[PDB]
Amino acid sequence: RKANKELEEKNRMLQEDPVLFQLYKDLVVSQVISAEEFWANRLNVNATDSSSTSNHKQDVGISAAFLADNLTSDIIESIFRTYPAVKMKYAENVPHNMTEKEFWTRFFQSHYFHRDRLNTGSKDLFAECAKIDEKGLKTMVSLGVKNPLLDLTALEDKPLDEGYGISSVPSASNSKSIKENSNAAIIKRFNHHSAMVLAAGLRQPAVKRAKLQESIEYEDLGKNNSVKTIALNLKKSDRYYHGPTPIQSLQYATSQDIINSFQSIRQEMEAYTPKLTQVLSSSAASSTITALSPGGALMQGGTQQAINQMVPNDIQSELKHLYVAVGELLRHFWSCFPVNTPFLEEKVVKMKSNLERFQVTKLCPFQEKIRRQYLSTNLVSHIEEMLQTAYNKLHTWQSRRLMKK
Template sequence: MEESSFLIDIITLFNIQFNYVINFSKMATSSEDVLLQVSNVRHKKGDGTLYVMSERIGFMTNNSDTMSSCYAYTDVKMQKISSEQKQKVQLQLVFHSGESVIFQFVCPSRSDSVTNRDAVKGYLTKLLPKFQKKVNKELEEKNRMLSSNAALFQLYRDLVITKIVDAEEFWSQHAPAYINKNGASQQQIGVPGNFLVNVKPQTDGCNAIKYNLTADTIECIFRTYPAVRQKHLEYVPHKLSESEFWVKFFQSHYFHKDRMHTGTKDLFSECAKHDDQELKKELSTVEQSEVNLNAFDNTVENEGYGLDNTEASSGSNNIVSENLIKRFNHHSIMVLKATRNNTEQQDTETGGARKKIRLLNEDESCELGQSEVKKIEKTNINLSKVEQMINGVKNPKTKVRNLHTILHKANSMRDNVCYDILNYRKPPGTTYLTPSNAVSALGELTPGGLLMNGLLEDSQSLAQLVPSEIEKEFRSLYLTICELLRHFWACFPPTTPTLEEKLVRMYDALRKFHQTKLNTFENRIMVECSTLNQQLTAHLNLILNTAYDKYSNWQSKRKFPAGLPIN
């Protein structure tokens, strides 16, 4: 009996621990830690536990295994606490949207409630500024993109400010098309060969040198020396600070490399070995000419002409000079390698074999070489009228004679028509055209009439009739509608629930934009430019109605799938 009760207690304890593990796994992700856990907290008329995590704050009610409320720090604007005179010990979170939530600490003693609230307040005081800086950086980047891209800014005004699309959806779906378009047109800045020379050191008067490094200079160093970038990722900020790392870099670059043997404490000794390997690799890839000039033997095999195999011993000065030249060559190779465009190389290498330098012998003549025979492609002539080739070329005199006869006939016909018009007499009492019909016919023949469409030299085009302000607004409407329609048609065929949800959302956005923007624009045209009528927005209404018809057909197919009878 005692053993069974002992087993029951163990199973109960295991279930409690297992439930706690489940609750904890549901509460936080693998990359998020719980910093503080406070019980006896009331939120939205429910008692539970408050969890302060690394990226959000959550509340879980008692006897529950899921988080009932969770708030990200990026959405929190500020925190407020209740005054000491009030009986309730409360903590309020105010969000950027203007909403707020309240947590009330309901410990048995007021001192414990104040202690718990102050602990939560302390953690939030440390965490909120970090996320506010992150939010501020994101807002600055978005403001920069909107100010640099007029089309994106106009799209933001038409969709987000009018609340047709929320801001999160705009930046995730609509903005990348404009951002990538501008980013693709920008050219990457190259690496100058003297970027380290431009870093002008300054002495502080205490036998120390001060370097002012900019972000562009650091990026040039990373692109020229990839091994330094790897060292920076390994040591900063875990083992060294940013300033200490660059001090060691310049010490190694300007002092340690001139030594015969670098010390083991040098942080960049491995980088120097890596540079030597890269230099040997690059030199091995240099293509030689067809003729190896070193293969010719011009030495005289006599005594005293330096045929001994023993090499001359080089002094230390030669080694220093060789190291300096090697460093110059390596720097030039890495700069060229950093600015090299791989895509252009692939395009140029695919087009035929590369030409090599040919060294011709002086006794060789171009006339003695084999002449290249060009292949001429023979094509058959297709003759539609064979008799034209058989009869030959006509006599030009006959052509001139025929031309004179044609002109004579045309002049005679013109004279006959003029004689008939002058001698025409209308019979009395006959009317061919009423005055009203004549006026209407003249109206159709005037600029802007139906019979004058397409004759731009006689009438004003539609672009000339539209004022500049209306044209600017019409262009923005056109771009916005095309952007919404692009996402609308991309949802077809809606094979997943996500696409169906997006399709419904895009349809609602089109309807809302049509009612709020396009109808208002059409009413303005009717008042200010009545001559345009509905010509300006005819195409917009056409593409919108096409999208509406497509959506209605899809809705009917959803209600009545194929194979089911429709009553």
Template sequence: MSSMWEAGESVTTQAMAQYRKRSGTVYMTNRRLAWVPDGGLAPTISIKHDDIKGLFVSAETAAKVMIKIVEIKPDTSHAFVFTSGNAVKERNDFKDRLSTILAERQIRANVAAGGTGSNGGLSSGGGSPVISDASAPGTPKASAQSRMGPGGVRRGLNGSGPSAELKARFELLKQNKELAMLHKELVMGKHVTEEEFWESRKHLLRNKTAMDQQQKGQSSAWLDLKPETGESNDVKYVMTPQVIHSVCQQYPSIKRAYDNFVPDKLSEAEFWKRYFQSRFFHRSRSGRGANEPDDDIFDKALEEDEEETKSAPKRIKLDHINMLVDLSTTEEDHFESYTTPDSTMAAGKTKESKEAMPLIRRFNRYAQRVLNSTIGPKKPSTGSEPFNINGVERAIVLDDLREQKEASRIILDIQDTRRYFESQGGDLKSSKIAEGEDPADILKRCYEDFTTNEVELNKPFAIPESTFDTLMKNVKANRAKMMPPKDGSQLLPPQLYQEATACHAAGNEILRHFWASTSPDKAAKHMRMVESLKKIRDENVKALMIQASSLGAECLDAMKMMLKPMQSAIQKALKHAETARSKPAITRKLA
């Protein structure tokens, strides 16, 4: 194989892969990607690193594990299907390697174009890497957002390398449409650099990386294999490594047969072909009959599976269970009861429950295997759990029922209690009756005031209907004032409203960078943000106003209302920048 490669060329990654339904091996070297058919002596597909425009990958749940390489040449692409038992890992190795190559090439392009190295922005041409997760086999198509992959990258999060951070950035842009539009407006519009854009979004990258690193547990759903119908009405079943793993975990007898016969006595394809023709596979499907041929392997597996489901599970030793949750420990205290156990709830007592018992046991055993595959098998018990009386007391003793001990306190000893209570009563001079005032006269005046008002407490008080009408009018008027007025989303066309929202978001983002760069050590960035604010004000806002005015006065007013807060903030920022520039000159003049 060494004669295939040029001098100084070395293979970094290789895997078994089909190209146009032909079997072969795909190689990744330090110079190119090459595919060699089985039995071939030289690559029939050879793509240099600099000729790769982008790449696509199939979804994790797709039937075929694919990767598609797009060349810079127009309408030229190559799709490879990985066929080994470790196809997903091999495909991901190729994807990571290609992503790193594309990212490094983008950095070199930014430096050559006079950029800032790893701070370079996106490229709308052929230099931007493209990665896509397709939801179905075949040739995947990238959306408008997926074509905007970030170009320059620095070292990855947690030292994971540039490809990991590149992937995290790209996935965030693909999942968040608003973030992708803001990235396009700011970075591709050359208002801020790539690093400045992501500097304030490190938490998003960390969260995305943490979520990607989490291992997803196996689904407990019962596997249901459904056939696919081809063009010639032939029925076929697609067996991926994930499907094979699920079948073997769901049916241990099939796994034992697989381990005994594959690949020494039967090929993998022949084994699964006989499985789909056996009684084992068709036993729980409608339309089954006695037409399935006899098969020593799967008939024996069927007998083992049925025997396993018929037998009751082994009794579990309860010695290690805590006494607080062990319900069997108090069983002797409940003999005398006004209720009797429901016999229909006892397993295997009725005809219906007897028929359902094998299916219930099969589900329970499968659920237990899924649980063990996630948390691992349970460790054998070393003996009964020691009885801890302190733990029992903490669980059953209520603090509210305990006798409360009086807290230690210092007794306040007051010699003259009369003076103490007088001081606590406050100023009582204002409550004294004025000199010369008779208390009887005060009570008489209060009684006269009460009787002259003619208040009849024993009769209901009727409210006039006119009062209700006035109250209702006031409520409706206040509700109308509280209702939000029609905003731009209701008055502007959807496309124009989206452009106005993007402009508003871009302006706020540039304002944030402007106020964060007011220190003297960031003078260059500060001046760049000033120019960006002027561009937003003079170009973007003006263009939106022209479009809105062409649609009528109502749309123009709505556009002004939407952009007024941002325009005011931009005007304040530009005034601050002008004042800051004029201060040094005034200082020199005064000196």
């Protein structure tokens, strides 16, 4: 019952991830800790459905145009972002007096299924609404970024004068055809689709001059070749030369031995070209072979590796459950443990960790009694080593902080 919600969460988990549900039971159901703590400190998930959505790139009416032959696909979500008039129309139509049954029944009508006349398929009226949004930005609605950039004087220079001019013939009030008007209308729709796309993806002296400025700037010489290099001139590199190898017993004796050894080995290598020193070498060959063989010297009675493969499979399943559970326990313990975090909230979390630790040891002893009393094998004492080290760090931290009282 717990929390109308959470009850679905911890539940959804317990159900799915079979390696995690198990754990959740082995810990909560086993009476070691409480369900809230476990689901509480187990935050590991994604940000959103994709950490954002897919912005309307372009051709949101012409990606899979008018044919699938608050949730939807890429096209419906991009229209929901892009044209908020269609958003408010979806607020009106769908909320009042019709449903998707009636609305899609009125969608398989002409211009979308009967192929009547609308200069293109089902994105044609969307392009007409984008052209109306462009004409609202040009006629009804205005812009925003218009100061030194998009200067009024530059706009004033264009369009010549109202009175008759040498080449006034520019916009003709006459000459409105069918195909010519359609081509002009298509251009307006495409230009505003880009403008709406810029508006949807928001979560002249302006452009040409600003990128000319980006090409300028003396950034290279602004600071330095490679910013502020912290030149790493090592002080004591001899610590690198003889590294982390411990100091071997290296006591070469007095330099009289240098002179004695130089004398003896200059006299020694004087002899050469015996041809035959192999009387001793045949002795060596009869002797070298024995070392190679297992019998005699050079064998350690090694590579034995005596194992205890008696009841493999179900004990392996037991140990999978156990190492998952104790991994989660020591995960929380050594994750909160390391820095003391000297306040009262973290110390209270450490006390809850202490309670979970003691009940974890009780559940581990119960699992060892219920498991290892079957055929008398399979030391589980590694998990007891891990939990004993948790026990030890807890008591050592307690004595350390009581010394730090």
